[PDB]
UniProtKB/Swiss-Prot annotation:
Subcellular locations according to the entry: Cytoplasmic vesicle
Protein name: Thaumatin I
Gene Ontology cellular component list: cytoplasmic vesicle
InterPro entries the record matches: Osmotin/thaumatin-like_sf, Thaumatin, Thaumatin_CS
Organism classification: Eukaryota, Viridiplantae, Streptophyta, Embryophyta, Tracheophyta
Annotated S-S bridges: C9-C204, C56-C66, C71-C77, C121-C193, C126-C177, C134-C145, C149-C158, C159-C164
Short name of any one Pfam family annotated for the protein: Thaumatin
Length: 206
């Protein structure tokens, strides 16, 4: 499948694409404002994520640090990033269907639209000013709005027992972005698309 990743933000982001134990495509790249990066994702990829990283510094070897979404100091991410990270999540070609969602379970850093570029399903967006409105206890100094599990590390926020409910903190994310997952057992906002759809992730869509 092809994903076009577009940075519509006024600031540079360092896109990342991983399935947790490997890079997707090159795994990461700098996107200046307006730049588009087209990646190819192998069919059947399960548990892929795309996110943006902010305020990164990398040397010529591709090693460095970002204030949000750092994936072990690498430009080309192999692993998932450090919260807070708005996540585009996808599982492709799963019994003939693709499944996409946006998640705030690991917080929010950059607003995002995640839309098919092929026919037969709708996109999802989380484009509210979550950072601006972020509750004081969840604000990350580096930028971004952390989820409560990251901050507080309780069974309730992290849904460790597989039983958990919404929280004041999950409801904050859900109020601003109803179409994104706000906690682990949120009513799913997954979109089902035809298998082998193509997609565009747009940072700062509005």
């Amino acid at each position: 499948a092809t994903f076009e990743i577009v940075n519509r933000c006024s600031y540079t982001v360092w896109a990342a694409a991983s399935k947790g134990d490997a890079a997707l495509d090159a795994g990461g790249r700098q996107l200046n404002s307006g730049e588009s990066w087209t990646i190819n994702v192998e069919p059947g990829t399960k548990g892929g994520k795309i996110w943006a990283r902010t305020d990164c510094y990398f040397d010529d070897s591709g090693s460095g640090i970002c204030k949000t979404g750092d994936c072990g100091g690498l430009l080309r991410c192999k692993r998932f990033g450090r919260p807070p990270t708005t996540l585009a999540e996808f599982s492709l070609n799963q019994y003939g269907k693709d499944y996409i969602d946006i998640s705030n379970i690991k917080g929010f850093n950059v607003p995002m639209d995640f839309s098919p570029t092929t026919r037969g399903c709708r996109g999802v967006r989380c484009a509210a000013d979550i950072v601006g409105q972020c509750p004081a206890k969840l604000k990350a100094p580096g930028g971004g709005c952390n989820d409560a599990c990251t901050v507080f590390q309780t069974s309730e926020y992290c849904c460790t027992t597989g039983k958990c409910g919404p929280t004041e903190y999950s409801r904050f994310f859900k109020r601003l972005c109803p179409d994104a997952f706000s906690y682990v057992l949120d009513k799913p906002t997954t979109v089902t698309c035809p298998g082998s759809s193509n997609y565009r992730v747009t940072f700062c869509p509005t």
